[PDB]
Design a protein around this ligand. Structure first.
Ligand SMILES: *[C@@H]1O[C@H](CO)[C@@H](O[C@@H]2O[C@H](CO)[C@@H](O[C@@H]3O[C@H](CO[C@H]4O[C@H](CO)[C@@H](O)[C@H](O)[C@@H]4O)[C@@H](O)[C@H](O)[C@@H]3O)[C@H](O)[C@H]2NC(C)=O)[C@H](O)[C@H]1NC(C)=O
Ligand code: NAG
Ligand code: NAG
Ligand code: OIW
Ligand code: NA
Length: 497
C-alpha cells in the first residue's frame, strides 16, 4: 500500500526508511482468481515485494528451465517464522517515539507487514542485555523463594510482546530459551566461561534448575503470556569452551539426555505447563545427528522431547543432507526447527552493513535450504538493533533486519526483512512443503508449499547475476511463464481449483 522510501549507505542495495509518520506497508495477502497467478518481486535494484499478475496457460513448449510442482508429494507442516525479543531489541524499539514503535511492530506482526507468528524470549540475561542477571541471584536459594522477574521482563519485554499479539491476526507462538543459570548452581560460579550445573542430573542442583523453568512459566502466565515451547538450554556446547565470553551453561549430549529424562521432563510434565513443548539441542547443526542419537535413543528422555532446535552459525561447514537429512531419516517423528540466525557474528563479518543484498540472500537461501530438509520453522535473532549492532554487554555486535537510528526517530528495514517476508507473509502455520523438481541444472533456489486451503506458494531466489527465464508447471492447472532476474527473490501464489 505505501512504497519503500529508499536510502543507500553505499552497500549493494537500499534500506526502506520509516519514522513516526511514514513506513512502507503491504496489503494483506490474497490468492488471485483461478486461472491467474500473483508474483511478488524484490530486487537488488530496489523493488520491494512489487505485485504483478499473469495468466496460467494450458500448454507450454520450449527448451527453457521447467519447475514441476509435485502437489501430492507431501513433506513437513510449517510451524512459522519470527524473531527474538531480547533486552537489546526491546530497548531499541522503546527508544523510538510511540508512533514509530507502532510502525516497527506493525512491520513485523500485522498483515500490512510480514505476519510473524513466533517470538523467542530469553529467560533472563544474554549477550544482548546491558545488565547480567538471572531470575534467582540470591545465593543458595534452592527453594527459589527469591525467584522474580525484573523490569527487563515486566516493563520492557512483556508489554512489547502484548502489543505484538494485539497487532497479530495469526496465533503467535512464544519460545523460551535460557543462556545461564544462577551462578550458585554452576561449577565455575560465573555467568560465562567453561561451567556446567554442579553435581549430576537427578540431584538438588538439577531439580532446582528444572523448577526454575516452571517458576519462569508461572511468572509469565501471571502476566497473561503462555509459551508454545521451551529449549533445554541455548547453545549448550558453548559452556564446554574454555573462556566462553558471555552467558552459557555447558552440557555434553549425555548431560542433556539425563537432565531431560530425570529433571526437566518430569518437572514440566507434573506442572500446569505440561502442554508446553520441549526442544533439545538449540545449537549448531554440525552437532547432528550425534546429539539426536544420544538423547532420543534413551526412551526416558525421548518421551519428553517434541523437537530439535538448530542454529545456523556452522551451516557453511555442515552440509544439510548429512545433518538435517540424516536426523530426519533416523527420527522422522521429531520435528526440526531453526531457532536462531543472524549475520555479523563471525570474525570476517562486519556487525552492520546497511542495505546489504548479500545478507538478504543469506536469509532466503537458509530458509529455502532448511525447508528442503524438513525444518518446520525459522527464527531470526534480535528483532531490532542500533547502527553499531547493539547494545550488547560484551560488544558482540551483529546485524538485524531492522536498524533503529534514535537521533532521527527513524528505523531502516533492510533486505533481510524483505527476504524473510517472502516466506512469513505467504506461508501460514499448517502449510505443507510439497515437491518441486527442475528439468535441468540451474542456479536458482526454490521451494513449493501447499497453503492450508490447497493453493500453491512457490519461492524462487536467484543468487546469480544472470536473468533466468523459467516456466512453473502445475499439472492440474497449467503453466506460469515467468523470468527470475539476477539477484531477485519471487513469491508466486495461485489457486488450484
Ligand atoms: C518521515 O518520513 C517521510 C518520508 O521520507 C518524510 O517526508 C519526506 O520529507 C522530504 C523532505 O521534506 C520530502 O522530500 C522533498 O520531496 C520533494 C519531492 O516529493 C515527492 O517525491 C518523493 C520521492 O519520489 C515522494 O516520496 C513524495 O511523496 C513526493 O511526491 C522534493 O521536491 C524536495 O526537494 C525534497 O526531496 C518528501 O517529499 C517527504 N516524503 C513523503 C512521502 O512525505 C518526513 O519528513 C519524515 N518525518 C520526519 C519527522 O522526519
Ligand atoms: C494445447 O494442446 C492440445 C493438444 O495438442 C491442443 O489440441 C489444444 O488446442 C492446445 N491448447 C489448449 C488446450 O488451450
Ligand atoms: C527471600 O525471600 C524470603 C521469603 O519470602 C524473604 O524472607 C527474604 O528476605 C528474601 N531475601 C532477599 C535477599 O530478598
Ligand atoms: C546466537 C548467536 C549470537 C549470540 O548473540 C547469541 O547469544 C547466540 O545464542
Ligand atoms: Na563480526
Amino acid at each position: 500500500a505505501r512504497p519503500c522510501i529508499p536510502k543507500s549507505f553505499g552497500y549493494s542495495s537500499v534500506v526502506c526508511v520509516c519514522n513516526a509518520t511514514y513506513c512502507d506497508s503491504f496489503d494483506p495477502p490474497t490468492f488471485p482468481a483461478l486461472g491467474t497467478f500473483s508474483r511478488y518481486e524484490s530486487t537488488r535494484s530496489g523493488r520491494r515485494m512489487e505485485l504483478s499478475m499473469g495468466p496460467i496457460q494450458a500448454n507450454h513448449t520450449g527448451t527453457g528451465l521447467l519447475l514441476t510442482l509435485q502437489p501430492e508429494q507431501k513433506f513437513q507442516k510449517v510451524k512459522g517464522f519470527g524473531g527474538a525479543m531480547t533486552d537489546a531489541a526491546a530497548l531499541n524499539i522503546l527508544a523510538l517515539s510511540p508512533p514509530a514503535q507502532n510502525l516497527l511492530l506493525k512491520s513485523y506482526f500485522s498483515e500490512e507487514g510480514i505476519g510473524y507468528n513466533i517470538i523467542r524470549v530469553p529467560m533472563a540475561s544474554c549477550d544482548f542485555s546491558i545488565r547480567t542477571y538471572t531470575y534467582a541471584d540470591t545465593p543458595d536459594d534452592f527453594q527459589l523463594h527469591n525467584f522474580s522477574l525484573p523490569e527487563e521482563d515486566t516493563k520492557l519485554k512483556i508489554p512489547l510482546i502484548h502489543r505484538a499479539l494485539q497487532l497479530a491476526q495469526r496465533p503467535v507462538s512464544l519460545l523460551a530459551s535460557p543462556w545461564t543459570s544462577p551462578t550458585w548452581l554452576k561449577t565455575n560460579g560465573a555467568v560465562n566461561g567453561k561451567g556446567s550445573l554442579k553435581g549430576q542430573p537427578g540431584d538438588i542442583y538439577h531439580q532446582t534448575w528444572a523448577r526454575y523453568f516452571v517458576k519462569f512459566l508461572d511468572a509469565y502466565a501471571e502476566h497473561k503470556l503462555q509459551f508454545w515451547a521451551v529449549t533445554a538450554e541455548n547453545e549448550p556446547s558453548a559452556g564446554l569452551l574454555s573462556g566462553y565470553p558471555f552467558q552459557c551453561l555447558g552440557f555434553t549430549p549425555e548431560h542433556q539426555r539425563d537432565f531431560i529424562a530425570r529433571d526437566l521432563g518430569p518437572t514440566l510434565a507434573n506442572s500446569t505447563h505440561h502442554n508446553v513443548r520441549l526442544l533439545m539441542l538449540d545449537d549448531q547443526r554440525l552437532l547432528l545427528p550425534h546429539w539426536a542419537k544420544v538423547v532420543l535413543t534413551d526412551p526416558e528422555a525421548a518421551k519428553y522431547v517434541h523437537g530439535i532446535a538448530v542454529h545456523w552459525y556452522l551451516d557453511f561447514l555442515a552440509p544439510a543432507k548429512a545433518t538435517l537429512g540424516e536426523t530426519h531419516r533416523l527420527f522422522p517423528n521429531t520435528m526440526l526447527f531453526a531457532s536462531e540466525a543472524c549475520v555479523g557474528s563471525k570474525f570476517w563479518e562486519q556487525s552492520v552493513r546497511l542495505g546489504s543484498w548479500d545478507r538478504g540472500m543469506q536469509y532466503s537461501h537458509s530458509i529455502i535450504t532448511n525447508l528442503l530438509y524438513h525444518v518446520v520453522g525459522w527464527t531470526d535473532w534480535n528483532l531490532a538493533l542500533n547502527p553499531e549492532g547493539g547494545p550488547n554487554w560484551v560488544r558482540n555486535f551483529v546485524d538485524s533486519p531492522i536498524i533503529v537510528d534514535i537521533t532521527k526517530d527513524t528505523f531502516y528495514k533492510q533486505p533481510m526483512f524483505y527476504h524473510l517476508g517472502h516466506f512469513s507473509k505467504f506461508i501460514p502455520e499448517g502449510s505443507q512443503r510439497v515437491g518441486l523438481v527442475a528439468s535441468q541444472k540451474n542456479d536458482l533456489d526454490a521451494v513449493a508449499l501447499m497453503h492450508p486451503d490447497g493453493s500453491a506458494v512457490v519461492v524462487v531466489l536467484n543468487r546469480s547475476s544472470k536473468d533466468v527465464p523459467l516456466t512453473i508447471k502445475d499439472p492440474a492447472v497449467g503453466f506460469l511463464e515467468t523470468i527470475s532476474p539476477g539477484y531477485s527473490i519471487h513469491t508466486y501464489l495461485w489457486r488450484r481449483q
